[PDB]
Design a protein around this motif. Structure first.
Motif, PDB file in Angstrom:
ATOM      1  N   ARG A  13       0.805  -1.097  -0.109  1.00  0.00           N
ATOM      2  CA  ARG A  13      -0.090   0.035   0.013  1.00  0.00           C
ATOM      3  C   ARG A  13       0.980   1.291  -0.122  1.00  0.00           C
ATOM      4  N   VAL A  21      -1.413   7.319  -6.478  1.00  0.00           N
ATOM      5  CA  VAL A  21      -2.572   8.029  -6.558  1.00  0.00           C
ATOM      6  C   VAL A  21      -2.345   9.688  -6.315  1.00  0.00           C
ATOM      7  CG1 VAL A  21      -4.738   8.750  -4.841  1.00  0.00           C
ATOM      8  CG2 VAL A  21      -4.176   6.363  -5.688  1.00  0.00           C
ATOM      9  N   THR A  28      -4.189  15.601 -12.152  1.00  0.00           N
ATOM     10  CA  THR A  28      -5.642  15.811 -12.583  1.00  0.00           C
ATOM     11  C   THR A  28      -5.554  17.486 -12.088  1.00  0.00           C
ATOM     12  OG1 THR A  28      -6.666  14.024 -11.986  1.00  0.00           O
ATOM     13  CG2 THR A  28      -7.743  15.926 -11.552  1.00  0.00           C
ATOM     14  N   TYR A  31      -3.687  19.533 -14.874  1.00  0.00           N
ATOM     15  CA  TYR A  31      -4.546  19.626 -16.181  1.00  0.00           C
ATOM     16  C   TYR A  31      -5.898  20.655 -16.040  1.00  0.00           C
ATOM     17  N   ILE A  32      -6.603  20.159 -15.042  1.00  0.00           N
ATOM     18  CA  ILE A  32      -7.914  21.156 -14.581  1.00  0.00           C
ATOM     19  C   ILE A  32      -7.373  22.391 -14.846  1.00  0.00           C
TER      20      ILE A  32
ATOM     21  N   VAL D   2     -10.501  11.865 -16.716  1.00  0.00           N
ATOM     22  CA  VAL D   2     -11.131  12.982 -17.177  1.00  0.00           C
ATOM     23  C   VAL D   2     -10.812  14.164 -15.969  1.00  0.00           C
ATOM     24  N   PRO D   3     -10.116  15.128 -16.380  1.00  0.00           N
ATOM     25  CA  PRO D   3      -9.716  16.316 -15.562  1.00  0.00           C
ATOM     26  C   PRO D   3     -10.900  16.946 -14.772  1.00  0.00           C
ATOM     27  CG  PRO D   3      -8.564  16.573 -17.447  1.00  0.00           C
ATOM     28  CD  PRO D   3      -9.550  15.470 -17.745  1.00  0.00           C
ATOM     29  N   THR D   4     -12.087  16.419 -14.899  1.00  0.00           N
ATOM     30  CA  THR D   4     -13.236  17.002 -14.213  1.00  0.00           C
ATOM     31  C   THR D   4     -13.190  16.994 -12.776  1.00  0.00           C
ATOM     32  N   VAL D   5     -13.839  17.987 -12.178  1.00  0.00           N
ATOM     33  CA  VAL D   5     -13.594  17.737 -10.748  1.00  0.00           C
ATOM     34  C   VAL D   5     -14.275  16.665 -10.212  1.00  0.00           C
ATOM     35  N   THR D   6     -15.226  15.889 -10.679  1.00  0.00           N
ATOM     36  CA  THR D   6     -15.530  14.675 -10.144  1.00  0.00           C
ATOM     37  C   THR D   6     -14.465  13.634  -9.840  1.00  0.00           C
ATOM     38  N   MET D   7     -13.512  13.450 -10.891  1.00  0.00           N
ATOM     39  CA  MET D   7     -12.486  12.567 -10.758  1.00  0.00           C
ATOM     40  C   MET D   7     -11.384  13.118  -9.737  1.00  0.00           C
ATOM     41  N   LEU D   8     -11.285  14.387  -9.659  1.00  0.00           N
ATOM     42  CA  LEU D   8     -10.534  14.749  -8.720  1.00  0.00           C
ATOM     43  C   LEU D   8     -11.169  14.489  -7.249  1.00  0.00           C
ATOM     44  N   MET D  11     -10.693  10.688  -6.705  1.00  0.00           N
ATOM     45  CA  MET D  11      -9.115  10.478  -6.311  1.00  0.00           C
ATOM     46  C   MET D  11      -8.783  10.946  -4.972  1.00  0.00           C
ATOM     47  N   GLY D  21      -6.779   3.316   5.781  1.00  0.00           N
ATOM     48  CA  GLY D  21      -6.594   2.149   5.920  1.00  0.00           C
ATOM     49  C   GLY D  21      -5.183   1.568   6.248  1.00  0.00           C
ATOM     50  N   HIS D  22      -4.082   2.262   5.611  1.00  0.00           N
ATOM     51  CA  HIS D  22      -2.743   2.030   6.003  1.00  0.00           C
ATOM     52  C   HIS D  22      -2.441   2.170   7.494  1.00  0.00           C
ATOM     53  CE1 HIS D  22       1.496   3.052   6.255  1.00  0.00           C
ATOM     54  NE2 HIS D  22       1.739   2.106   5.133  1.00  0.00           N
TER      55      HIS D  22
ATOM     56  N   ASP E 169     -13.649   9.366 -23.254  1.00  0.00           N
ATOM     57  CA  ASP E 169     -14.283   9.899 -22.028  1.00  0.00           C
ATOM     58  C   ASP E 169     -15.764  10.366 -22.256  1.00  0.00           C
ATOM     59  OD1 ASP E 169     -13.602  11.736 -24.092  1.00  0.00           O
ATOM     60  OD2 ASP E 169     -12.841  13.209 -22.517  1.00  0.00           O
ATOM     61  N   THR E 171     -17.359  13.036 -20.039  1.00  0.00           N
ATOM     62  CA  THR E 171     -17.501  14.469 -19.656  1.00  0.00           C
ATOM     63  C   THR E 171     -17.426  15.382 -20.688  1.00  0.00           C
ATOM     64  OG1 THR E 171     -15.376  14.275 -18.779  1.00  0.00           O
ATOM     65  CG2 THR E 171     -16.851  14.031 -16.991  1.00  0.00           C
TER      66      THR E 171
ATOM     67  N   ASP F   3     -20.509  15.286 -11.681  1.00  0.00           N
ATOM     68  CA  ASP F   3     -20.495  15.821 -10.332  1.00  0.00           C
ATOM     69  C   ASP F   3     -21.466  16.461  -9.767  1.00  0.00           C
ATOM     70  N   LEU F  82     -11.400  -3.906   3.524  1.00  0.00           N
ATOM     71  CA  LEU F  82      -9.970  -4.050   3.839  1.00  0.00           C
ATOM     72  C   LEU F  82      -9.408  -5.001   4.783  1.00  0.00           C
ATOM     73  CD1 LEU F  82      -7.037  -2.593   3.605  1.00  0.00           C
ATOM     74  CD2 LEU F  82      -7.651  -1.282   5.817  1.00  0.00           C
TER      75      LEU F  82
END
Lengths: 65, 589, 460, 44, 315, 207, 153
Positions: A13, A21, A28, A31-32, D2-8, D11, D21-22, E169, E171, F3, F82
């Motif tokens: 992990r 990540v 992200t 780019y955004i 996708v650089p869209t804020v949803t993916m941000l 993540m 979890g770690h 994609d 979006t 979103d 987990l």
């Protein structure tokens, strides 16, 4: 056996999951921002310039007539 | 003369200024609101009014000033409180009576009605003078005798010299005639915030700043005129270090530029600084405010004033340096200045470069930091001053990726790297020795060699010990302290002792409140000698830990030894403790 | 002695803006009145003025405007406001029209909104303490007179209900330590249901004498929503400094105020600022917050407690980050606690107040207050860690101390965190409740508690 | 991606959950190692 | 609309669908009126793809039925904004005023959006998302809403606009608006292509809003909806189980976990994969879906009602 | 799927008091109601207090208990993903059982069948009351844990010994509302009485 | 080039290379005539460069083009130009080989970004001008060995 498995999971992990990540989040964000915000602001500025020199041309025509 | 024509929020467009210059301040309207000229389109100009623009009526007269943003220097600059646009807050409150800052206050920066005892130099009345000459000296206060000098960029044959008497600022005391014309000069003088004070020649920095804290003075020295950055945003530790610098540092005077910070923090500073007092070598008590000029800018204040406050403060520091005094300038928050810069850039619609900051952020920041260094003055007699900046970095989110942080780190020479973790670790100095770095170590070669030839070797060994300690921490976390070699175990124990006693200075106790260079160097020498003579001895680890415990106690007593006990007495005690540790380690083995 | 000039040169109607043609010497923010052709009267504010041409943004929309038949009377006054002592106990619209079925206020004096800033020399550090009523804020992150603390929250969290609770239960600690208190409640862009909730809460408050309630509905014009914080802070400044009264200002859903600022900035046709929101939002919110402080000259002070909604349920949004940078505190509303149905969803661990030390003292509050605050915070963190440990190990491997921390966390969430919406606790009572929570630990276990203070209270 | 804020946001949530979890797995591993050390002492 | 990216065989599957297009009612269906009269509109296609489609329709034997409108990439951009409109008009006439069922294949809607963006930039209007014209939604709505059955006439129009995700994609404004408008979405997945399955359809994001009305007693078996619901549930649970097994370890997975993984493998191997020149009946295809379902136990098939279970579990 | 920070969404959630946020995962899970029970919220709760009190005073507490159970399940789903179900305790076991029972019986309404086409409030409150009562009885049983038995052993026992009640709790959904409110109320009261008999005889046997 | 982030000794490495530079020799009049451009350097670093070059005895064959950060930002772009012009004259039209050294190539970039933003031009990646590829090409793509001449850059 259990401690070896758990230590392997934790090390995997720490070395792979977060280490992949975090670059994903950084890419992200980069780019955004540097694409969407920059190009939107540039489009808005170009439109503002278009309106400005349209008004300038209108003023020039009014001066001519 | 000149009437407003287009008043759209902050920007005001007025006709009539055919002769207006770019970046010239101008007064707008009856209320005499202050604004700068940006765009000189045709016969008209562009005024960004700093204060609120509400209530303005068209054809309100606009009055030109014939001067860029300038700060009125001279005697009496010290002690008082000034805004970002060089407005004396205390006198404004006194004269106005009310608490709020009136929209259109016109109080001069320095009260010209106050009388200062002016003492002229022995310069001849028919002599010849040039810029930077120390033609006189005025006793603006105690401890900061103001060595007034002839204005820079002015050279002439003197015609008249005033005698020693009580004079006002408006009163003229000097007049010179190089050409046929003779121009009189007053004690007060002006200089633009942007253009730096003329300097004959920048000098290589040679002597260090003594902060009074053992960690910064010893591990990571900072030269006179050396740029320093503090990563402080919470806990007021940066304010603590600023207070320590004001009380004990080598700076003949200190200028604190607080811009864009919260109002409560500014109020806390404005009450805390007067409470502090600085002890002379003579020992009698004298207040720090008499030697300190404080510039405060809250969030309520106009953004442009907040941006220009930094240049105002650095220009005041430049005047002090040209007056031939070592001076330290502290910026409360460079990140707040960056926020002011981004706000102004958004107001003027510039193309963003990185995270909203304008492209020219790097250039402005680099220029401001580069306006500080050891300097050979202009004029005569030849004297050397120094401006050292300890501007504080306040990254939002505590990430160095912030463009302002990266630029500062690229520019700054010394970064003391205060960490909140050490504060959470009950460390008063809270100086992270690891993430902090010093780039002026080589500059201290002559000074360290003169003071102590082995001091350089001691510092190098201490850095190596810190590195070995940070390695041994995870090594112990791996298997344990026992698995380490006897010499490694001694090294770990000595590093722990160094961190506990030498590196960590309480500064709350009277004995540790101020740590001189002599005491700190002697403590480092005692620690390094004990560690060395213990490492060669191994004999066992546990066995020498027990038999040399008296040596460890004696070394810890060096921290107990204080300048409060007397500098020669502290030096003698440190020498005795080092000798006792040497005897205990050598005789036992 | 000066009479208005009624222009009738409406030339060009665009969006929410109306443009006059030939106006002799207009003022910039001179408020202006518009008579429709049908005779309807609608107010407006003059925007940027060019040479003899002035553009006007009007309230209540631009419908019905005709170029030929609409007249524009120029008042020439820059949005003055009537303010007086008797303004207390009444509810006012966004602009300030009394909606309490009462007489219009008789002005003690007319004041300019967006008042000139305090000379920073006159500012003083926060002192004393104020009972929020909610024990969690009262203890963990206390608030002193003169400290501006925002309250971050998200849509769907009962931010408004908590604000009403604070309005009801607010009172000076000094009463317990041994009527100058006042609240200026300005609600921006609240919904109709929440408007009724506030109106009923004021009707049955029993504390009307000390509360004034500025109310700006969603249906209200956006510019009115902009000016509501201004008039609110102006009235608060009068009632605090000109009247010597400690004043607690609550601003709810300032995200609506930011949105209205965005709207007016777009109306100016200016380029949008970074991240969508206008660049000048920093200066605007600074002007809104910085009016809170303690004046050395005047005994009265101002405390600012904005209720700022955090978009997308995070503080990464420009407005929450900006207000956090400006202000000196951050109390939080945890979504899980509301989901777990604890009426105060206060997130104690994220909760923090920068000036907690100044608020707590011997003369004001009790000496053990800060000590128990730190001890409870550390013990709650330990309890969360032990809950995770019980989850991962099956709870059998836990020692006795682990079970102690678990039961402490359970009792804390059961009693201290959960408070009756109408239940009121004095800060002394809150400290007593926290102590009763603390008795379950052994005396030695309370490491954070200083000696000779533990035995002072742990005896019970 | 996708650089869209949803993916941000996704993540960011994944990273936060991974960190939690770690931490939990580290605590569990430490406890198991302590128990194994005690068992090893008994076996010795 | 079929959703694909660069490289995915959207053209090949489009040609397959054109040859395989047929009625299904009780497997009963000259049919000259019932002839689908395919109208094919390709915009900004490589000449290789153009020759491919031309040869595919020529060899299909439907050359007397299909009709092709081509706007190649080297052709002027402006022409491409009219071609789908011309195709829609021709389909409307041949369907409504001529009484023929008509199927429409629009190709590379992304190319159409490119022409729209070019026109908007040339006219210098305010942008929308990603610099596109703000009215692109209206244009796509007008280009899509021109299909469907009509009460007053025996004709009908069914359109299958293949769409190219620009960066793979959704979006992106074009696929987003298309999803907003169109009542379905078929996904072609790069992961499926990586394992070399000729039809790469990712069944998970695939959905038809009118699928429930489409399936009927005459159209399909009465348990077809139960089969679809069970397949969704099994695939979703299997994906979650695969993730759980990956994180915890292959051995740590439970018995039902390995059952779900086996179901996923067998499904993606036999079911999804199909030949290139081979069509297929519906009823025995549903029988094979029941085989995949009866791989799972009866108890696990909670989604399927017990009646249809007794109807078609054993078979 | 998009979103929920979209400007239209942000504007709506500012003024709207009730958001019935549907879940894409639930839709893919073929869960027909598809309403997410975490993002969704109804600010109108305080107003309906009098209505709920006059209808059924106990409904508020059982609703809060159901919400808490759902929140706990959602919270520890990450942990069980987990760490694994091995460390799950008896309380965790009954919590997961009740969460699955909710997700299947309660939140799922097919609406294509006469029994599920419309669910009157009286039937909904009774089903929730039954689920919460079973959860409470299981909690008390595993809490007793006496007689050299109980806790997880009690949980497994009631899973097997009282499996009939657990199975017919699911069938309680299939109870046809058209049969009439008095009949359905009688049937649900009988089911509640039997559930009370359960875990009471299991209490008498002391495992 | 030499890739090196902030805080690294790359400037000292460049100074060492410049002082220790020489032909393989496996002569002196046509030997390496080093041109040392300095785009946007700190005053302390500038003093270091001056001292190291003066003391090393390489001042017989080395030309410096110092440009501090205090200088106007535009004056920064013309620097690594003037330097290359002098290098071209010395190598091709004068013969002696040149080993041009540019420091802080990034500072040149920043100088461009600032000037481009002032000009309000089309931005490439990260707000840098879109034509920076060209304007670096004009700087890098000069060194080489023209045939007709024995010089070399």
């Amino acid at each position: 056996l259990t401690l070896d498995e758990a230590i392997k999971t934790t090390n995997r992990r720490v070395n792979a999951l977060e280490n992949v990540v975090k670059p994903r989040l950084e890419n992200t964000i980069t780019y955004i921002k540097g694409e969407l915000d920059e190009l939107e602001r540039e489009d808005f500025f170009r439109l503002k310039k278009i309106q400005g020199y349209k008004k300038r041309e209108i003023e020039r025509q009014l001066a001519s007539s | 003369y000149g009437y407003v024509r287009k008043v759209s929020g902050p920007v005001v467009i007025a006709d009539g200024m055919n002769g207006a210059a770019m970046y010239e301040l101008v007064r707008v309207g009856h209320d005499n609101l202050i604004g700068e000229i940006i765009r000189l389109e045709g016969d008209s100009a562009t005024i960004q009014v700093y204060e609120e623009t509400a209530g303005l009526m068209v054809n309100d007269p606009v009055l030109r000033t014939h001067k860029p943003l300038s700060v009125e220097l001279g005697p009496g600059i010290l002690g008082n409180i000034f805004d970002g646009i060089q407005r004396p807050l205390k006198t404004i409150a006194i004269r106005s009576g009310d608490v709020y800052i009136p929209r259109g206050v016109s109080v001069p920066a320095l009260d010209k009605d106050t009388l200062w005892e002016f003492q002229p130099k022995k310069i001849g009345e028919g002599d010849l003078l040039t810029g930077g000459d120390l033609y006189a000296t005025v006793f603006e206060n105690s401890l900061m005798q103001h060595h007034v000098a002839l204005p820079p960029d002015a050279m002439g044959k003197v015609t008249y010299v005033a005698p020693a008497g009580q004079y006002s600022l408006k009163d003229t005391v000097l007049e010179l005639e190089f050409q046929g014309v003779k121009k009189s000069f007053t004690m007060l003088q002006a200089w633009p915030v942007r253009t730096p004070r003329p300097v004959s020649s920048k000098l290589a920095a040679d002597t260090p700043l003594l902060t009074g804290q053992r960690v910064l003075d010893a591990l990571f020295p900072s030269v006179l005129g050396g740029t320093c950055a503090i990563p402080g945003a919470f806990g007021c530790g940066k304010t603590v270090i600023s207070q320590a610098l004001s009380k004990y540092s080598n700076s003949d005077t200190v200028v604190y530029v607080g811009c864009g910070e919260r109002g409560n923090e500014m109020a806390e500073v404005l009450m805390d600084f007067p409470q502090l007092t600085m002890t002379l070598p003579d020992g009698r008590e004298e207040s720090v405010m008499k030697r300190t000029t404080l510039v405060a800018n809250t969030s309520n204040m106009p953004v442009a004033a907040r941006e220009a406050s930094i240049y105002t403060g650095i220009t005041i520091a430049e005047y002090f340096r040209d007056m031939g005094y070592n001076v330290s300038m502290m910026a409360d928050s460079t990140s707040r200045w960056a926020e002011a810069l981004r706000e102004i850039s958004g107001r003027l619609a510039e193309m963003p470069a990185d995270s909203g900051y304008p492209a020219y952020l790097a250039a402005r920041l680099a220029s401001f930091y580069e306006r500080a260094g050891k300097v050979k003055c202009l004029g005569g007699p030849e004297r050397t001053g120094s401006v050292t900046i300890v501007g504080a970095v306040s990254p939002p989110g505590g990430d160095f990726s912030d463009p302002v942080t990266s630029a500062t780190l690229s520019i700054v020479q010394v970064f003391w790297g205060l960490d909140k973790k050490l504060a959470q670790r009950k460390h008063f100095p809270s100086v992270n020795w690891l993430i902090s770095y010093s780039k002026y170590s080589t500059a201290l070669e002559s000074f360290y060699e003169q003071f102590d030839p082995d001091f350089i070797n001691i510092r190098t060994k201490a850095r190596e010990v810190l590195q070995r300690e940070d390695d041994l921490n995870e090594i112990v976390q791996l298997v344990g302290k026992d698995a380490l070699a006897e010499g490694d175990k001694i090294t770990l124990e000595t590093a722990k002792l160094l961190r506990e006693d030498y590196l960590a200075q309480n500064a709350f106790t009277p004995y540790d409140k101020f740590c001189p260079f002599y005491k700190s160097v002697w403590m480092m020498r005692n620690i390094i000698h004990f560690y060395n003579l213990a490492n060669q001895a191994v004999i066992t680890y546990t066995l020498i830990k027990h038999r040399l415990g008296d040596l460890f106690y004696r070394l810890v007593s060096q921290k107990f030894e204080d300048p409060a006990e007397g500098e020669p007495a502290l030096v003698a005690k440190f020498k005795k403790l080092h000798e006792d540790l040497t005897a205990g380690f050598r005789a036992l083995e | 002695l000066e009479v208005a000039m009624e222009y009738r040169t409406v030339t060009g109607v665009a969006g929410p803006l109306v443009i006059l043609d030939k106006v002799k010497g207009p003022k910039y923010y001179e408020i202006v009145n518009i008579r429709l052709g049908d005779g309807t009267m609608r107010r407006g504010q003059v925007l940027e003025v060019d040479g003899e041409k002035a553009v006007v943004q009007v309230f209540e929309g631009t419908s019905g405007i005709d170029n030929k038949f609409t007249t524009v009377q120029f008042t020439g006054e820059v949005l003055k406001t009537p303010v007086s002592l008797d303004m207390l106990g009444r509810i006012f619209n966004g602009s300030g029209k009394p909606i309490d079925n009462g007489p219009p206020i008789l002005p003690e004096a007319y004041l300019d909104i967006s008042g000139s800033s305090i000379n920073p020399s006159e500012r003083t550090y926060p002192e004393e303490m104020i009972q929020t009523g909610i024990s969690t804020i009262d203890v963990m992150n206390s608030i002193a007179r003169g400290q501006k603390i925002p309250l971050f929250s998200a849509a769907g969290l009962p931010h408004n209900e908590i604000a009403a609770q604070i309005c009801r239960q607010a009172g000076l600690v000094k009463r317990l330590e041994k009527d100058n208190f006042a609240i200026v409640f300005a609600a921006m862009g609240v919904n109709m249901e929440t408007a009724q909730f506030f109106k009923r809460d004021f009707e049955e408050n029993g504390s009307m004498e000390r509360v004034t309630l500025f109310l700006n509905l969603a249906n209200d014009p956006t510019i009115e929503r902009i000016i509501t914080p201004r008039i609110a802070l102006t009235t608060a400044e009068y009632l605090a400094y000109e009247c010597g009264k400690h004043v607690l200002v609550i601003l709810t859903d300032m995200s609506s105020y930011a949105d209205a600022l965005r709207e007016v900035s777009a109306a100016r046709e200016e380029v949008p600022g970074r991240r969508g929101y206008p660049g000048y939002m920093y200066t605007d919110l600074a002007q809104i917050y910085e009016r809170a402080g303690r004046i050395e000259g005047r005994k009265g002070s101002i405390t600012q407690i904005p209720i700022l909604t955090m978009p997308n349920d995070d503080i990464t949004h420009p407005t929450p980050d900006l207000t956090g940078y400006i202000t000196e505190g951050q109390i939080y509303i945890d979504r899980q606690l509301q989901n777990r149905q604890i009426y105060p969803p206060i997130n104690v661990l994220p909760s923090l107040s920068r000036l907690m030390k100044s608020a707590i003292g011997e003369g004001m509050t009790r000496r053990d207050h800060s000590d128990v605050s730190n001890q409870l915070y550390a013990n709650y963190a330990i309890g969360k860690d032990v809950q995770a440990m019980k989850a991962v190990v099956g709870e059998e491997a836990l020692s006795s101390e682990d079970l102690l921390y678990l039961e402490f966390l359970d009792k804390f969430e059961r009693k201290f965190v959960a408070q009756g919406a109408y239940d009121s606790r004095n800060i002394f009572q809150s400290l007593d409740l926290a102590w009763t929570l603390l008795r379950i630990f052994p005396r030695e276990l309370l490491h954070r508690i200083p000696g000779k203070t533990l035995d002072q209270y742990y005896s019970r | 991606v996708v650089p869209t804020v949803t993916m941000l946001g996704v993540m960011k949530s994944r990273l936060v959950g991974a960190t939690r979890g770690h931490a939990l797995l580290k605590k569990k591993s430490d406890a198991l190692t302590v128990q194994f050390r005690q068992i090893l002492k008994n076996i010795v | 609309p079929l959703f694909s990216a660069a490289g995915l065989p959207h053209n090949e599957i489009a040609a397959q669908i054109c040859r395989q297009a047929g009625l299904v009612k009780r497997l009963e269906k000259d049919g000259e009126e019932d002839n689908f009269a395919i109208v094919f509109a390709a915009m900004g296609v490589n000449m290789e793809t153009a020759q491919f489609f031309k040869r595919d329709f020529e060899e299909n034997g439907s050359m007397e039925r299909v009709t092709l409108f081509l706007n190649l990439a080297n052709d002027p951009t402006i022409e491409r904004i009219i071609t789908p409109r011309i195709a829609l008009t021709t389909a409307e006439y041949l369907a409504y005023e001529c009484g023929k069922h008509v199927l429409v294949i629009l190709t590379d809607m992304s190319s159409y959006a490119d022409a729209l963006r070019e026109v908007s930039a040339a006219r210098e209007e305010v942008p929308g998302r990603r610099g596109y014209p703000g009215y692109m939604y209206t244009d796509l709505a007008q280009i899509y809403e021109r299909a469907g059955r009509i009460e007053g006439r025996k004709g009908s129009i069914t359109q299958i606009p293949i769409l190219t995700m620009p960066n793979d994609d959704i979006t992106h404004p074009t696929p987003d608006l298309t999803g907003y408008i169109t009542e379905g979405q078929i996904y072609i997945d790069r992961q499926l292509q990586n394992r070399q399955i000729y039809p790469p359809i990712n069944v998970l994001p695939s959905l038809s809003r009118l699928m429930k009305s489409a399936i009927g007693e005459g159209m399909t078996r009465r348990d077809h909806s139960d089969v679809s619901n069970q397949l969704y549930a099994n695939y979703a649970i299997g994906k979650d189980v695969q993730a759980m097994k990956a994180v915890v370890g292959e051995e740590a997975l439970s018995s039902e976990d390995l059952l779900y993984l086996e179901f996923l493998d067998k499904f993606e191997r036999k079911f999804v994969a199909q030949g290139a020149y081979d069509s297929r009946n519906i009823f025995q295809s549903l029988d094979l879906a029941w085989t995949l379902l009866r791989i799972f136990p009866r108890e696990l098939l909670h989604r399927i009602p017990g009646k249809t279970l007794d109807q078609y579990y054993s078979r | 799927g998009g979103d929920f920070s979209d400007p239209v969404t942000s504007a709506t959630l500012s003024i709207v008091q009730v958001f019935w946020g549907l879940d894409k995962k639930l839709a893919q899970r073929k869960h027909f109601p598809s309403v997410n029970w975490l993002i969704s919220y109804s600010k109108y709760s305080t107003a309906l207090e009098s209505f709920y009190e006059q209808f059924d005073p106990d409904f508020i507490n059982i609703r809060t208990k159901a919400r808490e159970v759902l929140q706990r399940e959602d919270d520890l789903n990450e942990i069980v993903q987990l760490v694994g179900k091995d460390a799950l305790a008896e309380g965790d076991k009954i919590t997961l059982e009740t969460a699955k029972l909710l997700r299947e019986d309660y939140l799922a309404q097919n609406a294509f069948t006469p029994y599920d086409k419309f669910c009157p409030f009286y039937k909904s409150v009774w089903m929730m009351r039954n689920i919460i009562h079973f959860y409470n009885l299981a909690n008390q049983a595993v809490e007793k844990g006496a007689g050299m038995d109980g806790q997880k052993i009690t949980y497994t026992l009631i899973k097997h010994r009282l499996g009939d009640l657990f199975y017919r709790l699911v069938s309680q959904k299939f109870e046809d509302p058209a049969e009439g409110e008095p009949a359905l109320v009688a049937k649900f009261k009988k089911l509640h009485e039997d559930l009370t008999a359960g875990f009471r005889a299991l209490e008498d046997e002391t495992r």
